Amino acid sequence: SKGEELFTGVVPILVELDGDVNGHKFSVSGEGEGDATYGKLTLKFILTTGKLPVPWPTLVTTLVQCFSRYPDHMKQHDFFKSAMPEGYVQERTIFFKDDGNYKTRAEVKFEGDTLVNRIELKGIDFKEDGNILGHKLEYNYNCHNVYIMADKQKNGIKVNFKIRHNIEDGSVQLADHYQQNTPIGDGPVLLPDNHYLSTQSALSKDPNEKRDHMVLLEFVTAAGI
């Protein structure tokens, strides 16, 4: 895969999310940059349309695993970069325990020199008295390991993992993620051996920013081979 060669230096990133949660419509734009050599993402996300109906942390997984650092001894397991530049479709179902679900479909590809993540998100069956619609979740994020499995018969990869969102009242809201990734192109991609991505995410605020937003710093490292 020459896909890998596109990630040697700093890559500009555009994220666009069109969202509908319980019929509440909203749009989010993200800009920043990824440096896959260090597994490093720096992004700023801004609500551009509507009022944000869900907590920022619940959108982190939805808002570019091609920026993961794969150690040299695992480069042949890096599906995300091998699909580039044509990209991959990333699909999820996210089950929020005892609450609603997100269905997401994204296209991650180069549009010129920019790595672009274009997402449609539909959320339904969220409770007005719940951790998501009642904005009860802490503005914070935990380190998570993501288990990546080849799905040979579907020419892609399958990803299961549970996000633990801390609530201010001292409970945890579980977010059970079911992920599939499939190339857009016809050219060869790497089907990996089983492995995981260790993801550290830091959420912050821009003190000069008046719009609803989220600043995100992430380090992602592949492991387990």
Burial class (CB within 10 angstroms; exposed 0-12, middle 13-18, buried 19+) of 171? exposed
The structural domain count of the chain equals: 1
Task: Tell me the β-bridge partners of 158.
Answer: 149, 180
What contacts 181, CB < 8 A, 6 or more positions away?
65, 79, 80, 83, 88, 89, 90, 91, 156, 157, 159
Give how far Cα 90 sits from Cα of 15, 74, 107, 125, Å: 13, 22, 6, 23
Rounded CA-CA distance 38/219 in Å is 7
Burial class (CB within 10 angstroms; exposed 0-12, middle 13-18, buried 19+) of 153? exposed
Angle (nearest 5°) at CA 71 between 88 and 41: 55
CATH at residue 95: 2.40.155.10
What residue has token string 């269905």? 103
Give the single-character DSSP code of 191.
P
What contacts 3, CB < 8 A, 6 or more positions away?
81, 82, 83, 84, 85, 189
Nearest to 157 by CA among 179, 188, 185, 186: 179
Element containing residue 119 per DSSP (H, E): strand 114-124
Burial class (CB within 10 angstroms; exposed 0-12, middle 13-18, buried 19+) of 126? buried
Alpha helices in 1-95 (DSSP H): 79-82
Q: What determination technique applies here? A: X-ray
**Entry resolution (Å):** 2.0
Taking the alpha carbons at both ends of the chain, their separation in whole angstroms is: 19
What contacts 219, CB < 8 A, 6 or more positions away?
38, 39, 40, 69, 199, 200
Domain housing 91: 2-223
